Amino acid sequence: NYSIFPHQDVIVKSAKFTNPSSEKLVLNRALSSQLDLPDANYDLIQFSGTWARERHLYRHPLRPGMQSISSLRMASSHQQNPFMMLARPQTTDEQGAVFGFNLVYSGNFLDAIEVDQYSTSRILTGINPDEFGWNLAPQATFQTPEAIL
Amino acid sequence: SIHVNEANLTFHLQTDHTSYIFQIMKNGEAGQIYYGPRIHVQPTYQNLMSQEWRDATPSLNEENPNFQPATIKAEYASLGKGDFRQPAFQVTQANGSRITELTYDHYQLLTGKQRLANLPSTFDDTDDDAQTLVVSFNDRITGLALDLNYSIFPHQDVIVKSAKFTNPSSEKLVLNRALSSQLDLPDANYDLIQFSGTWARERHLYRHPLRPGMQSISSLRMASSHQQNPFMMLARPQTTDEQGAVFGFNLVYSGNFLDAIEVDQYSTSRILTGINPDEFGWNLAPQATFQTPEAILSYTSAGMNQLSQQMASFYQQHLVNPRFAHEERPVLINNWEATYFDFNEAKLMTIVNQAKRLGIEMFVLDDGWFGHRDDDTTSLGDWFVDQRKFPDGIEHFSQAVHQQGMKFGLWFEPEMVSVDSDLYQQHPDWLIHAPKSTPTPGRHQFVLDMARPEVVDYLFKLMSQMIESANLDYIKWDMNRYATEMFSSRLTSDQQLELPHRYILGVYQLYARLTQAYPNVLFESCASGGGRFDLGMMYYAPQAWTSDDTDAAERLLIQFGTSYGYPQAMMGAHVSAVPNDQMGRITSLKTRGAVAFFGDLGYELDITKMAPTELDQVKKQVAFYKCYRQLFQFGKFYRIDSPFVEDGNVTSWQVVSDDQKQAIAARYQLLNHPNAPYTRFYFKGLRPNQRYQINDDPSTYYGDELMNAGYFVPTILADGQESKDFYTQLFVVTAILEHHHH
Amino acid sequence: IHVNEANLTFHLQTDHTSYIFQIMKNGEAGQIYYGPRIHVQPTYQNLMSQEWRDATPSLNEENPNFQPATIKAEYASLGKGDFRQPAFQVTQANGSRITELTYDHYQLLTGKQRLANLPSTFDDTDDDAQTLVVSFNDRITGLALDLNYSIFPHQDVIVKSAKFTNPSSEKLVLNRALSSQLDLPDANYDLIQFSGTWARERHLYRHPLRPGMQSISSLRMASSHQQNPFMMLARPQTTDEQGAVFGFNLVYSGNFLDAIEVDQYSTSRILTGINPDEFGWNLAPQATFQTPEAILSYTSAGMNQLSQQMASFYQQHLVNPRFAHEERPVLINNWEATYFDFNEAKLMTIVNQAKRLGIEMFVLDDGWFGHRDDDTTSLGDWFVDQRKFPDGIEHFSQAVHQQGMKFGLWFEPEMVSVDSDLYQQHPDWLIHAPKSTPTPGRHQFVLDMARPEVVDYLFKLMSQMIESANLDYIKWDMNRYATEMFSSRLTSDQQLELPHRYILGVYQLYARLTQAYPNVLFESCASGGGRFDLGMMYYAPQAWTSDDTDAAERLLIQFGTSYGYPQAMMGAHVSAVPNDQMGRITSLKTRGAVAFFGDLGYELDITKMAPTELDQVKKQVAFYKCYRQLFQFGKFYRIDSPFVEDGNVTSWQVVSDDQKQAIAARYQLLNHPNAPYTRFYFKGLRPNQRYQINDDPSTYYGDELMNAGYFVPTILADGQESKDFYTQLFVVTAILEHHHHHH
Amino acid sequence: AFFGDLGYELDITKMAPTELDQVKKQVAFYKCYRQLFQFGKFYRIDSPFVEDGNVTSWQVVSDDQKQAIAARYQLLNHPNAPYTRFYFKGLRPNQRYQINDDPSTYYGDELMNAGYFVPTILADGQESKDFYTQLFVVTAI
Secondary structure, rough: EEEEEOOOOOOEEEEEEEEEOOOOEEOOOOOOEEEEOEEEEEEOEEEEOOOOOEEEEEEEEOOEEEEEEEOOOOOOOOOOOEEEEEOOOOOOOOOOEOOOOEEEOOEEEEEEEEOOOOEEEEEEEEEEHHHHHEEEOOOOEEEOOOOOO | EEEEEEEOOOEEEEEOOEEEEEEEEEOOOEEEEEEEEEEOOOOOOOOOOOOOOOOOOOOOOOOOOOHHHHHHEOOOOOOOOOOOOOOEEEEEOOOOOOOOOOEEEEEEEEEOOOOOOOOOOOHHHHHOOOOOEEEEEOOOOOOOOOEEEEEEHHHHHHHEEEEEEEEOOOOOEEEEEEEEEEEEOOOOOOOOEEEEEEOOEEEEEEEEEOOEEEEEOOOOOOOOOOOOHHHHHHEEOOOOOOOOOEEEEEOOOOEEEEEEEEEEHHHHHEEEEEEEOOOOEEEEEEEEEEEEEEEEEEEEEEEEEHHHHHHHHHHHHOOOOOOOOOOOOOOEOHHHHHHOOOHHHHHHHHHHHHHHHHHOOOOEEOOOEEEEOOOOOOOOOOOOOOOOOOOOHHHHHHHHHHHOOOOOEEEEEEOOEEEOOOOHHOOHEEEEOOOOOOOEEEOOOEEEEEOOOHHHHHHHHHHHHHHHHOOOOEEOOOOOOOOOOOOOOOHHHHHHHHHHHHHHHHHHHHHHHHHOOOOOEEEEEOOOOOOOOOOHHHHHHEEEEOOOOOOOHHHHHHHHOOOOOOOOHHEEEEEEOOOOOOOOOOOOOHHHHHHHOOOOEEEEEEOOOOOHHHHHHHHHHHHHHHOOHHHHOOOOOEOOOOOOOOOOEEEEEEEEEOOOOOEEEEEOOOOOOOOOOOOOOOOOOOOOOOEEEEEEOOOOEEHHHHHHHHHEEOOOOOOOOOOOEEEEEEEEEEEEOOOOOO | OEEEEOOOEEEEEOEEEEEEEOOOOOOOEEEEEEEOOOOOOOOOOOOOOOOOOOOOOOOOOOOOOOOOHOOOOOOOOOOOOOOOOOOOEEOOOOOOOOOEEEEEEEEEEEOOOOOOOOOOOOOOOOOOEEEEEEEEEEEEOEEEEEEEEEEEEEOOOEEEEEEEOOOOOOOOEEEEEEEEEEEEEEEEEEEEEEEEOOOOOEEEEEEEEOOOOEEEEEOOOOOOOEOOOEEEEOOOOOOOOEEEEEEEOOOOOOOEEEEEEEEEOOEEEEEEOOOOOOOOEEEEEOOOEEEEEEEEEOOOOOHHHHHHHHHOOOOOOOOOOOOOOOOOOOOOEEEEHHHHOHHHHHHHHHHHHHHHHOOOOEEEEOOEOOOOOEEEEEEEEEEEEOOOOOHHHHHHHHHHHHHHEEEEEEOOOOEOOOOOOOOOOHHHEOOOOOOOOOOEEEOOEEOOOOOHHHOOOOHHHHHHHHHHOOOOOEOOOOOOOOOOOOOOOOOOHHHHHHHHHHHHHHHHHHHHHHOOOOOOOEEEOOOEEEEOOOHHHHOOOOOOOOOOHHHOOOOOHHHHHHHHHHHHHHHEEEEOOOOOOOOOOHEEEEEEEEOOOOOEEEEHHHHOHHHHHHHHHHHHHHHHOOOHHHHOOEEOOOOOOOOOOOOOOOEEEOOOOOOOOEEEEEEEEOOOOOOOOOEEOOOOOOOOOOOEEEOOOOOOHHHHHHHHOOEEEOOOOOOOOOOOEEEEEEEEEOOOOOOOOOO | OOOOOOOOOOOOOOHHHHHHHHHHHOOOHHHHHHHHHHHOEEEEOOOOOOOOOOOOEEEEEOOOOOEEEEEEOOOOOOOOOOOEEEEOOOOOOEEEEEOOOOOOOOHHHHHHHHHHHHHHOOOOOOOOOOEEEEEEEHHHH
């Protein structure tokens, strides 16, 4: 699913799984949004902390392999918030290219940016794959929470 | 335009996009208010001129404790009245004292901008809405008179600054220091961006945050360095070629300079540029005056490309010799790296006849044609034919070329004198030399005393005679060493510190008088390849031999660095022999050429020695260059991928025509790597809503496609034949003009 | 020091470093190497290799490859093919500025003697020092130059200077006379400087070198508040714990230059000495000129090590020996307590309370002379003000002394107010440029110290006061910067000699006062730390570090000062709150705890304090006294730096000689909730020695405390006080008893 | 707390009359501008996450840009300080504004490009000068 809200430059994404078949299927992982990008010259900006010190801003250049924030506490945590940004190195509050990403969801989440062998980026947001598995019986459906891009 | 508020003595210069604002204050001196993006004219700026008490620093007086020069942004400060920052000037009296108390007297607002009388300088010949503000002062102590000149060039966002000192008093005054411009800024969050290097590796880009105290670049070499160029920038930390606030500063002068930046106790910046205060002293007699070179200032919010481009336009209309500033430059051939000293009119006509066949348009006869010069060791100053290699003198050779359809130019090194030459037997007193000192050679030669008018006259005669004798179309004017043990016997003992500057003035006299007399001869300035690549020269000679380094990969860094302060129209660039004579690199003829297109193309190798296939490639290169010459030489220049940022393995820039309907981009890669990421090239400078075609690719692209999403470029693959290193990808972009329902 | 006379290779060896240079083909001295110690060798043909580079002059035609632009020099001039900045320059009668030094002879002495008229370094402690004097002559003017180099092997210090001699018959002018030049082979260093201003001196700044000039300087006839003469060149990864670093300081107190130039070939010239700007010295025939001394030093063991050795060097070979090692008294000063609003009776209440607290010395500050009821009058009238002292000062000190206490008072000698008896007696004594409008500084002007009549008048006035009032101590302040510089005592040509002469004058005064009354402790001052330099420590073993006496601000100021100066040199007073300079409020515990790491003093109206507050102070004083030797002279380690990271935590440590006692301190500026666990890492202890910390009953091996750390209790809210600006103190005691160890 | 949803969480019965009065005016000030505080377009300016983070600043602006409020916060006061210059965002360049009780009127572009000079934070011997707030109410003429 792709919902365009032209006047705010927002795109909303989700996935929906239907099992028209007759055999039992299990979803081990069901993310709301994957974004693949031509390069990796971006900073991941994130919001981390804990109780009484939530959502301080951290800003780190992407590097090959995995960088992610996530919760396993059945709540989007105090520790890591679902909203994240990929910004160009020279981007500021006042100027420059940048992407925002959020989750309309309040449980276990995952924000993940993977830089692969060719220096491209994959951005994954949605329900945390760890501690998750939906039993999708014949004719059943699974709707993922919406991702705000 | 320039707005004055007489009631308040507020001076506000507005370019199309910037404001430079200064005010006369209770103590009579000028005080900098603001310089940045344009703001509304006001009668006065009280809030910005707010003063607060600060401890442990001197005050004006007891009625004004809070008036403290240490915390007041100045426009042209002295040292000794409470400010301990670096001064813009300094004057010594007869009694030893160095105190000056400038006080405002009157101003003057003139339309346009006239040349200075004896210095290269800026002008408004083109109804471009320039104005000049002259603001005068008198010293309460010495009677000294000072004019500060600010000229607004509104359409290129450029301000030009200089000082003229006048002595209407009856007592001798010594100018210990006379800078061209001072800017005081309220903060110090900038990077200093400079252009440093040396011979064969000039003007590499260096970028550094400001720190408390002094950070300067300068020259003592009696010339603007190979080591340090006068052009500099203050960029905000996040500013790039594509976006952001940045100040640019330059200096129309070719002698000793200072670009200095002091960050003081209050994290404020002072930017001073002008003649280097070191090895400088000027005796200002009664009724005497002294004019400083012009500093060039500019600001933009729109990034460093924007900065370069408006200063480039400014130089093109307001500084560079008008006779050539917009005239296509010829594709020359040179015999320097081709043969060096080993030649004569015989082997030199073989290269001339071959030149014509390739489409080349001018032959330059380089070093070796005079006196008995077969070594780099003899004959400098003997500017007449070497009859060993030119039996019938030069008139003959220059004619053989004129008839093959080609312009002819030749080489001179006027300021120099070789010990083994006719000049040193006739005028040994014309060598620059300290009395009991042991002379120090540089390239086995010494330098003429250019402060001597007679020497300038002797040189104007030799070159006049020679330009008429041979019908010269061009002159390469070199300068191959740095003066040593400076002393002139013509000057008083009190006048010795006047030498470096009087010397440069003498250089200017010569250039001035030659260009006056032969307005049609094209000059190329040279100093071992641009150890004098500066605006001072560009006034007279509209191009310079960028660098003696002719290697394609090294030229990438030099041309890329130089483009910050100077348009490609100003950089000579030659395709040369491989492996490179200076450091030994092997490049493809395709690359060496592609790098030279973004300048004033020319060739500097033995073309007689080429196989028929190579010969034909040159021929195609020259035609292609000619086809697109208006765009290579004068096109709006854009830097893209920088060699000075990250691995610096990829370099890319682009040129775009006035209407933006045509462009040529080039991407260069030093080292080729295996299993490579896809290439995506982002074009700059196009029209978003204009469709384009790119080389022989069938598809059409809107400009926002090419700029935003970029253009996919095929991987560089090994073919077993040649090295994939130092590799070039050209992109000829052309509008598809057509009605369309977008 | 090892000389190879056959090759004229001079090679200096300290315990761990080697400074090596060589006399060269053209007669000038060529720098070879300065770095960790390397073996003595007759010649270093390898290190001295020369190659042809283009577009730069060569010596002559026989040696194309001898090019001064690519040759590391020891003391270079401009004009001979080198275009870098020169160490010196000389103008002849004819205007020529060319100079051709040519080596003639050398001399090797033992120890090190003071300089005649300048503060300087000495070896009177039989410490294996040596002085090498390398003399040259100019082929052009006949001028002679002595290059001095004293080795101090045990602190890894080499001290440098220059002395110019004119044996010719013609006048010579020195336009530039630096004290030290050092050329290094590369430019991969960070320049570390100490910049600031009044009430915020000497914050640390750390920047990578770049092509061109990066310097810091002073044009204010003092090393400034703004820039200190001490600097470092660190390798990029050097820290306080590990790594290579050079240190440069200067025994001078006037205009200085610290300059580092990276040339076209990425080499570095470090120049240090008198600021070439606003300077020029007329050298008549038979005349001489001595530069102030440059201190040089290197280590591979990091910046703590650099400060520590340099500090051992200063304590043994620079500081006034009368006080170098003597514990400094706990004092109280009435400045921030009363300001000008006081009289004898009011001050007696202070002196009396001060005593019951255990304080050891009272210091009467500004206001006792002439009619000082303001800061705009009587500056110059160094005699008793009878409105506030009816029976002269002699009485008030008699009282102080009968109390078993010491007495000190405040002068500002170099200064003159227009409303003053002095001005009406010698107006011509004000530094003033003939036609100019006099520019006030804190409503005062400066005396021409360049005149020997002035020094005599001041010496007489001050000694009369030391004898009359039996002074134990003098605070010698200096509260504005000179302006419109001129001396009628000097000719037109000598005007560029005022700044240095004025400084020599100050030394003259300190020199005569300290020789005639050597039991007087001089605390140097300049609106706080506006002259905080080696030049003054020679005479005055301690300086008033900053007028800023806020706890939080001092952390920064002291941390930075310690890179260049040991705590023995830093006065520090516990002041009142909310701080008068900038308004911060701080616990009395913290103000106390930042001030222990220096020379503790009190600058508050203790007559206006509650009983519990008084008791707190009494205990700070007993505590400080108990550990005074440790606090003032113990080896100093910086740990956590307010100049690294977010700067929220500053910590340091002083350690005894035998490493059996230590006091550490951690200060946090801002408290944060739900915090990480604190681990403090002690430095400077003996690995296998067992220690105890405060009242914690456990015993720890040095290596536990240094490698694993010490867990420290989180700072918690208690509903009673702010937990900002918090201090944790750690008293470390060695357990001494027989023990069967398992190491 | 103004830059959000204002609320109180303390024993207001333990305060004194003048503190009580301060909260009274705090609340009236907030309601007067609640529409702009809660829903104005929000701009971050000086970030505590960049460099020393000693200074924090932000601003809310109305839809028509004729009205706005800014706040600059300073954790620790420092002596002998550089002059302060505050740069406003999001105003209209050619529109004239007033600021708090300043009598002058400034064009949008002065306030955004040149900045607005803010007086030093001075010690007064009465209160700490740490955690200091400078509030600018910005109104079109």
